[PDB]
Amino acid sequence: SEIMKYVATTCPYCGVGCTLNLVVSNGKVVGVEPNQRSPINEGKLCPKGVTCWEHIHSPDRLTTPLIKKDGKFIEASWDEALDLVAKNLKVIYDKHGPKGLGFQTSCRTVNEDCYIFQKFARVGFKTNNVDNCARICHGPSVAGLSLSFGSGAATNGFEDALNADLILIWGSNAVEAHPLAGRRIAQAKKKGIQIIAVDPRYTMTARLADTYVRFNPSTHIALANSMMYWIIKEGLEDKKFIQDRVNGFEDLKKTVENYADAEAIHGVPLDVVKDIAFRYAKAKNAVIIYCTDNVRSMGNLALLTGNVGREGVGVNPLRGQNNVQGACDMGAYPNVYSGYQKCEVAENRAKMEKAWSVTNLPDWYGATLTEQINQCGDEIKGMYILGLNPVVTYPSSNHVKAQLEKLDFLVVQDIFFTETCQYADVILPGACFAEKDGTFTSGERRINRVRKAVNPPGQAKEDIHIISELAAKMGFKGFELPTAKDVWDDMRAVTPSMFGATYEKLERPEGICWPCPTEEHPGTPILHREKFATADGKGNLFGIDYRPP
Amino acid sequence: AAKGDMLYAWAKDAEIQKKGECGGAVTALLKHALETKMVDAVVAIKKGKDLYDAVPTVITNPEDIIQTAGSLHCGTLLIPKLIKKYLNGAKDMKLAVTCKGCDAMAFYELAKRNQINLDNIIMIGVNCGGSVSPVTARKMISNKFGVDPDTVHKEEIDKGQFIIEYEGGHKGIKIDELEEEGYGRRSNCRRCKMKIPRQADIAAGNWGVIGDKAGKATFLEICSEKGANLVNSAQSKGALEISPADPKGIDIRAKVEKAMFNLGDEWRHRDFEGMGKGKDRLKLMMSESSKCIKCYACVEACPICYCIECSTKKPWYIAPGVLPTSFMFHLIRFAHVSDSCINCGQCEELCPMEIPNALFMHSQQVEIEKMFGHIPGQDMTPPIHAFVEEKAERARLDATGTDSIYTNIFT
Amino acid sequence: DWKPQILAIICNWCSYAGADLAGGARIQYPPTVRAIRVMCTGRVDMLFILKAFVEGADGVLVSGCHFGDCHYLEGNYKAAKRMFMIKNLLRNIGLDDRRFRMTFVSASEGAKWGMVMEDVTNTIKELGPSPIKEFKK
Ligand SMILES: Cc1cc2nc3c(=O)[nH]c(=O)nc-3n(C[C@H](O)[C@H](O)[C@H](O)COP(=O)(O)OP(=O)(O)OC[C@H]3O[C@@H](n4cnc5c(N)ncnc54)[C@H](O)[C@@H]3O)c2cc1C
Ligand code: SF4
Ligand code: SF4
Ligand code: SF4
Ligand code: SF4
Ligand code: SF4
Ligand code: FES
């Protein structure tokens, strides 16, 4: 057939979204090659990207559906397994309404599968009990940055920090995780850019920094409060910015004026505090790289120094999962439909109803991952898990196992036989990133294409196909979407932003950044261009008091 | 026609001759070899996307080489290591491969180390005056040329300037001016001196073609009997036209080659003294190499690194988990590669941490060369440590005029 | 506070014999060099020398048989070529190449072994502490 064919794809291992070539010989992925054309990484990959191809053709991959029949799983046909799932979901619905079911996907999955998964969870039985890894993962920082600015995403890109004078890494292992985001720090120091690292431990990304600052762990609020106190005290705040685009300054004033001497809390001497504070406030264009109160303090700093809406500046919280941003965008949260359209507002609730040809959408705040797992027997019973391994990921794994065994009809879709699989009643095999054909979304809001290299191992299918077949079994209208392009077009019709991100535009190696409202718009690589995304269009900066644990 | 002839060559097929960068002779020769069954496949470069994307391609259908026609100056890749990894080193199948000077040198390095079969491989070598990274070319065009890069149709380095053809006209800027401003050819391409691959089987270029054929003929130099046979077969079956080259063309070809040698020497100088001398060079090297995150891209991309397991992976040399890795990691590559480095730049350009691997390695290589007199990538000469000789060892000890190896070795 | 750390890698058949003969003849020299004793100097890999220098050897000495007197017919020609190349690498990484030398000591040259010991110690003392130990940090 084919000998050494190159297929361009996105790396599935973190939020940088590096591009790579998979080498496919006789329908087998046999290696990973650089793609020098990519703007994100210029053909450069970390160890994970270099060896992403190893797990694709493992013998352990699930090949056919499995059904727990009075013990060990026996081999089932697709029709059999799907009819079983449809029957059990139907009965649990008809007995316990929409509260009885529970959905959660992984951030490993492509945008089209996250969107169709949340569409399945809402168009059919109307439940907002949909969620994903981002809760239990490191950062609920999206909510905090949303409160500060309006969009919880990173304000600027990665190439953008090359334009600053004062990259300020803060508590980030940006070279251990996101190494090709830390490549920007390496390039910047080669260009001679002031770099200040502030992690509690001397990490390999703190080696690159001109100044390194220890502080006692769990004291970010105190340290940032001190820095803002000195900025205010010597008046290096940005008056036009604060008076024009920011609100809450008096509250910040009261809250911070109690942090003149905080050496007791954080270990940083007042001399070093003044040094970093004045370097940051004096830098004309300074970018913060972060990795709830902790992220709103960063928003406080950026708003206080007027470092937001411009090239070479901003706040860039690093995500960590390959498609966590994409899942949140597609609307795999309890409270947002898609593109962060809140379900609390009847306006877009009715817009969803009209677009999806369904009635009486829930509007109540769903149950997050831990909410579901804790109430996994009390009112929730019946659970579809799209790619999670909760027994290995959640803390108190034994409690997780107890709750899952308290559960009626778990369904698990995975590419491998995990530990959570033993507790499933049905196991639907899935496809990995080399067999899907969707899109990922980087941490810098960039939509990248994933391309099909090989076929799923045996009888395994990809998630859009599985969910469409299940919805056709259960009699749900609106899941006639045979391709990732059709799923994407349905999503685009639904969402106001991302309306310009057609696949003919995503076939560009550059990709598209998420606020792309029209088809001629080139994208929005820098957010909050001259107005924010809150009610008055003005960022709010809050006063946080440090709580000792 | 016989191993040393210098010819003008263009394709009989008008479409092949249009799509060739010059006369289409590389694409006519490759097509002929494939369809007359000298070779079982053809490894060439095609555009996968915009002309800034160069994708290697194994082609077995003779109908697909018209897609390979044209030269991509943003193709900074290296072919021979892909043939070893995913084509079993050409141990069972004949191939015909289009290659630049660095790609011919890499072929010879891997054949020295027994990793490919040059009896099976046919190397059609192209002249190379330099390659540009695709993304750097984009930034060049956006900033210095003041053009939207997606507008460009074709783009080439001709007469030492960067001609781009966009909608509206064409432009040109001296590559030396660009290279001073911080753009241009890759660093190793600036230092390169393998301009006409005379170690390949055929050397094709646009240098020395003068007069009525200045854009519709390829200057061919027949560098081996295998290439002579390929050319004679193509000319007889009528896929390729041959006229003897013009002596004035040969002369100015020699002059341009010599000038490119001098420019390469100047860049070698300014770069190697830019690295420093004494303990300053050790702080440059050590502080740069402290960035390495052990992605091993430099090892997997180097043509000379053919080892099943690198010694950089052995726990008695490098501690497995310590990430701010030792200088031993790069000392083990200086020791193993620097004697034969072909200055391909792959190690430098695939490094996520932007470490000047190629600059360090070539700075060591140039004077390992002027010490032992071994030029990498030219022929089947075994590596310096794979062939030690009694008389030569006596000679270097006597030349030091000393009873040991301590001093009077360098000037 | 500082004592030179010199490491020697001496072959078994001429340099170890020469050092043993010097000891037997009671030739005194300073106690600064510690030896490793491989069979031939052909065994000495480049990575041994580089590993020593990166661990912090202020000096490295490799001692073997004279040319034409290797126990294994030609194993010290290979070592000589390797050490010439090592001298070149250390000069181009900016470390002082006179921290390394290769001496040819026969089995009967105990006096010459003592003189080699003295001269290596003197040269390293002049050179001073190696820079790697502070460049690491
Ligand atoms: C990056 C680059 C720089 C060059 N610089 C010069 C120069 O300064 N002076 C000069 O006289 N000639 C240069 N050449 C060669 C020049 O294009 C030749 O005149 C041309 O190859 C003649 O062949 P043709 O037009 O007859 O056949 P063509 O139809 O052009 O055949 C060209 C062949 O080269 C292959 N190819 C294309 N891009 C690459 C690449 N990046 N790496 C390897 N193979 C590739 C194509 O697949 C095709 O088989 C350069 C070539 C490249 C690729
Ligand atoms: S930096 Fe992240 S996305 Fe890029 S190759 Fe490494 S793990 Fe994959
Ligand atoms: S290294 Fe030399 S031969 Fe290779 S592309 Fe650069 S200039 Fe051409
Ligand atoms: S490519 Fe660069 S980062 Fe990767 S191992 Fe080599 S030197 Fe280190
Ligand atoms: S060390 Fe780097 S420049 Fe030298 S041959 Fe290997 S890849 Fe090419
Ligand atoms: S560095 Fe040395 S051991 Fe490692 S792959 Fe290259 S040649 Fe082999
Ligand atoms: S036996 Fe001593 S050098 Fe070989």
Characterise this structure:
The structure is cut from a larger assembly and holds chains A (549 residues), B (411 residues) and C (137 residues). Chain A has helices at residues 47-50, 78-96, 111-123, 141-148, 179-191, 220-234, 239-245, 249-256, 270-282, 293-304, 324-330, 346-356, 369-374, 390-393, 397-405, 463-474, 484-494, 503-506; strands spanning 5-10, 19-25, 28-34, 66-68, 73-75, 102-104, 166-170, 194-197, 211-212, 246-247, 287-290, 314-317, 383-385, 410-414, 426-429, 439-441, 446-449, 512-513, 539-540. By secondary structure, chain A is an alpha/beta fold. Chain A has a domain at 140-321 and 534-540: Dimethylsulfoxide Reductase, domain 2. In chain A, the strands form five sheets. Chain A has a six-stranded mixed beta sheet, with helices on one face. A five-stranded parallel beta sheet of chain A has the order 9-8-7-11-12, sandwiched between helices. In chain A, a hairpin with a 4-residue loop joins strand 4 (66-68) and strand 5 (73-75). In chain A, helix 3 packs across helix 17 (484-494), helix 6 packs across helix 9 and helix 6 runs parallel beside helix 10 (293-304). In chain B, strand 7 and strand 8 form a beta hairpin. Chain B is α/β, with parallel strands linked by helices and 411 residues long. Chain C is of the alpha/beta class and 137 residues long. Chain C has one domain (1-137). Chain C contains five helices and four strands; from the N terminus they run βαβαβαβαα. In chain C, helix 3 (75-92) links the parallel strand 3 (59-64) and strand 4. Chain C is globular and about 45 Å long. Strand 12 of chain B pairs antiparallel with strand 4 (100-104) of chain C. Bound molecules: flavin-adenine dinucleotide, iron/sulfur cluster (5 copies) and FE2/S2 (inorganic) cluster. One iron/sulfur cluster (SF4) is lined by residues 299, 305, 307, 310-312, 332-333, 336 of chain B. Chain A: [4Fe-4S] cluster binds at residues 11, 14, 18, 46. Chain A: GO terms for molecular function: 4 iron, 4 sulfur cluster binding; formate dehydrogenase (NAD+) activity; metal ion binding; molybdopterin cofactor binding; NADH dehydrogenase activity. Chain A: This is Formate dehydrogenase, alpha subunit (F420).
